[PDB]
Ligand binder design. Structure first.
Ligand SMILES: CC(C)=CCC/C(C)=C/COP(=O)(O)OP(=O)(O)O
Ligand SMILES: CC(C)=CCC/C(C)=C/COP(=O)(O)OP(=O)(O)O
Lengths: 264, 332
């Protein structure tokens, strides 16, 4: 029973916790499926909870983060209005998952107030940020990383901070967050480079900029190595989360080896 | 002077919500939209009426505004007909809601009380709104069952939160009972306004009324039941007598201004009658047939139409005279 076995059951456990919740509140089969297709969103919680020693607390915190991440994901499909899904169901399942998560995270936290504290602290940064991103599209790598630092980095960093606040002792809150923010930027690029052909995306899309020459391949490569670096350092701060080392390499090499050549 | 309080609390809630929408990146459209949510911004004052400390009362009041407004934005996002920008709505919605959780939690009697309340009936609320839009109402009963969720359960939660967040002397149960009753009253009013203001028809109460599928007198009864439920709640000790005029104002507004727009010619149903014994007989007459009516002591004398040119006569005691007749009296 290695680490990959833990990741997979963590992922199955989160998905089921989420689909059960979507269904119990009125979600149509289309919506239930759509949520179970959110693979990485259901898996990331497991990485954020890697510093949590007690396995029972870890599974609980893991699925509570999953409910809220899926929730924000649905609110997003709601603002893009392109999934063909029912807007009432989307809006409602979204509110429900979110409320259940709050309730689950608060009952796991050392101090209940810290959940709202984390969620409020950079709510303007995340929300004004998401707005600016869709308002004015990026045209160079600088503006891209700037935008991505909010809907990707800040977005996962909050779940990192929550993971630490609800994971008991032996949690270097600052590092978990550093890890999350760097890991997120990496995933955002991947997503961007996948979605160019899977979603038909262009405006502000990193792949589009690369293909148009507005962004140089080696810069993208640098950013990727920097992120890898920031992530390795974060999972090395005491107590440490050596489990995440191979994970950081997996997602980074995948963008370098599989995704990038597609655009260069 | 209590009206001077409702106005100032509404203005303060409005200020707090607009500044917040503005700082998060909301366009002036959206800012204008949230500032327009008048009753939404004003209801908080009603919910916090049992809060003795003014400073605390203002803080809970504006925190509730933040979340009610946020929920209304989400609702606009699910209808997608405000013309407002889908992204600003979603993000401003989330920002406000988050702000609200934080402010409410800071005033709560207990750490988990806010989230307990929000979770308790999350499913009833959410799944209820889903079913409301999924199966339009076809009779009053169905209408009331749907309104019980996005209406009564919706405001009831903020009622519970005001009690949880407003220090001592809060009859939790009564605050929530007032909110749920008052919510439905306001929901009916909205439905009968929005039939013409938004062009609404499917599952809409005015429509069901105009359609014959829902009877006027029933709507009047439900309205009366709601008024009584609300009055009782604000009567529980320590009491919130200040809400009495409020309860009457909204209930009476639906009965007097809104209802006639969808019934027409006396939608109560019981076309009034005058019973009397004329020429050794038994007679009853629809107030609609009564022509002239005058008073002689405590007797009410009158004439009416029997058929064709035919003109009938009658006189009753004023204590056997239906309200309507005694009205033609004064009005003649
Ligand atoms: C403030 C809010 C609600 C933000 C949306 C949450 C989010 C960024 C989800 C993941 O992004 P994504 O890369 O899968 O989606 P997108 O195509 O919109 O960038
Ligand atoms: C589950 C959720 C988020 C439900 C939305 C909340 C709601 C219906 C609020 C009251 O709006 P309203 O009924 O007074 O206005 P309208 O329905 O006309 O938009």
């Amino acid at each position: 029973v290695d680490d990959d076995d833990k990741m997979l059951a963590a992922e199955a456990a989160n998905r089921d916790h989420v689909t059960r919740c979507v269904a119990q509140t009125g979600g149509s089969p289309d919506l239930v499926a759509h949520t179970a297709a959110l693979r990485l969103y259901l898996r990331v919680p497991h990485f954020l909870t890697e510093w949590t020693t007690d396995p029972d607390r870890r599974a609980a915190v893991s699925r509570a983060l999953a409910l809220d991440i899926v929730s924000m994901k649905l609110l997003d499909d709601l603002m893009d209005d392109d999934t063909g899904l029912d807007r009432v169901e989307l809006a409602c399942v979204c509110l429900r998952l979110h409320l259940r998560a709050l309730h689950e995270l608060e009952s796991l936290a050392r101090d209940p107030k810290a959940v709202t504290d984390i969620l409020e602290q950079d709510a303007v940064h995340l929300c004004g940020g998401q707005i600016r991103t869709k308002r004015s599209r990026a045209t160079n790598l600088r503006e891209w990383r700037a935008h991505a630092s909010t809907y990707g980095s800040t977005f996962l960093g909050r779940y990192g901070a929550l993971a630490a606040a609800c994971g008991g002792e032996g949690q270097p809150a600052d590092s978990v967050r550093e890890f999350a923010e760097a890991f997120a930027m990496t995933i955002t690029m991947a997503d961007d480079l996948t979605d160019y052909d899977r979603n038909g995306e262009r405006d502000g899309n990193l792949a589009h900029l690369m293909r148009t020459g507005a962004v140089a391949g080696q810069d993208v490569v640098d950013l990727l190595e920097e992120l890898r670096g920031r992530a390795l350092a974060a999972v090395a701060a005491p107590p440490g989360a050596p489990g995440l080392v191979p994970v950081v390499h997996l997602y980074t090499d995948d963008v370098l080896v599989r995704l990038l050549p597609r655009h260069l």
